[model samples]
Every structure is written in C-alpha cells, then in structure tokens.
Target: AVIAFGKFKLNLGTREMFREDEPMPLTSGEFAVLKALVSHPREPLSRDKLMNLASIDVQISRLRRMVEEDPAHPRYIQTVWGLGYVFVPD
Candidate 1:
C-alpha cells in the first residue's frame, strides 16, 4: 500500500499526533517532496525509510508537508506509532 505521511495535528484530548488538518494548509515544497517519492517505488519501504529514499530522496523535514496537507501525496497503508512520520508498522 502507498503511504502518504501527511500533516500531523496535536490532539488535545489524548495529546497525540494525528495525521490530518482542518483544510490542512501546506507548502509547494511539500508537493515537491511528493514528486520525488512517486518517481521511485520498489519494496520493503517503511515510512521511516523515507529519509534515505535512494534516487528519489528529499529532506525529511520538507517532505512531511504536502500539496497543502496534500495537503496531494502516497496512499497511507499504516501510520504505526508516534508517527511524526515514523511509520514503523505494527
């Protein structure tokens, strides 16, 4: 499954990171990150591995934000844990 680590929001009730935003605003740079990832997809790709996306690698910090919260970006297979983009699938 394609995983898109979108914008994270602070949940007040649980104090956790949830992947979504109200009209999640993002940067053009975020889309650029998506462009980089989409071009290269193979196997055993954990979301945390994005930091080293071989030929299609972008800055970890920059890639997190997408085409506004994609704000247009991956297909989110699983979020795993604290995420913050760390997709250590369970």
Candidate 2:
C-alpha cells in the first residue's frame, strides 16, 4: 500500500519516499515519524504518543532532526507549545 500527501508518497512495502515519481531517501526513524503524522493528519499528536506509535525513544532533538528540515523553525511538524507536535500538511 501507498500513502501520499502533497508532494510526498510513502511506499509501505518498501518503506521509501517519493517525490513526483523520484525516490527520496529517508531514515527508518524519519519514515516512522512521517508515518505517524500521515496516518493521523487531523490530530495533534503528543511527543509521548508519537514515540509510542513509532516505537522510538522520546529524543526531541533527534526526532526533530529526522523529521524537520530546520529543527529550529519547523514547517511540517509544528510544536504545539505546551502540548506537543502537530503535523501540518501542505
């Protein structure tokens, strides 16, 4: 199965990302993070929740590095201040 959003296409079988038919490389953690967000687009997922879903450690800095292009100023995964991270799809 394939999950697609915006310019990104995730191949579940291969665990690969694609942009307009071109393959885009992503780490396992990165793909997990993206999968969590893509699977629940309308929800605001907390760090704990994301970690549980992705089965990853709650390492904020590392998770941000894997998911966000700019960890300081993130566009896709927005920090919900006191809440957590929210997936903002374009």
Candidate 3:
C-alpha cells in the first residue's frame, strides 16, 4: 500500500519511503515505526503500544532519530506529554 503524508510517501509492500520521489534512508526499526504511524494516522499510540507494534525494545531513541529530523522538536511522532506518542501525519 502507498501512504502519502505531505512530501513523505511510504510503500508498505516494499518497505520504502520517499520524499518527492527521492528515497529516504531508514533503518528497519525506523521503517517499522513509520509503518505503524502510517497505518494509524491522527491517533495517539502509547510508547508500549508503539514498541509492541514495532516488536522492538530499547531502541526508542534510535527510532526517534530515524523518524524525526529534530528529535528534540518532533513534528511527526509527537509526545503526548503524559499519555504517550501521537502519530500526527501531515
């Protein structure tokens, strides 16, 4: 399936993401995280839920680096303050 959000486009079948047709480099875990977010846009998913969905542990920071241009000021996967992370697609 092809998912488009702003300039980002993800092809789930091939596990690839592109920005305006240019390939975006991503780790396997990063791809998994992106996939999860794409699968459920406009929804808040907890850290535990995200980890479970990605089947990964102890890689939250790594995942953030891959998905967010600025981990400190995340725009895509945002922290819910107390709840968890929310997948806010553009």
Give the clash count for each candidate: 6, 0, 0
Off by over 4 Å in 1: 1-22, 43-59, 64-90
lDDT of 3 at 8: 71
Q: What is the lDDT of residue 26 in candidate 1?
A: 35
- TM-score to true structure, per model: 0.26, 0.68, 0.75
**Against the correct fold, how does model 2 do in TM-score?**
0.68
Residues 1-61, model 2: lDDT tens digits: 7986655677988998777788878778877877887788767788778888873434445
The prediction achieving the highest lDDT against the true structure is 3
lDDT of 2 at 42: 64
Per-residue accuracy of model 3 over 36-74 as CA lDDT, tens digit each: 766877787777788888744335566566567787787
Q: Which pairs of residues have clashing backbones in candidate 2? A: none
Q: Considering TM-score, where higher is better, how would the candidates rank from best to worst? A: 3, 2, 1
On the 0 to 100 scale, the lDDT of residue 37 in model 3 is 68
State residue 84's C-alpha deviation in candidate 3, in Å.
Answer: 1.4
The better-scoring model by lDDT among 1 and 3 is 3
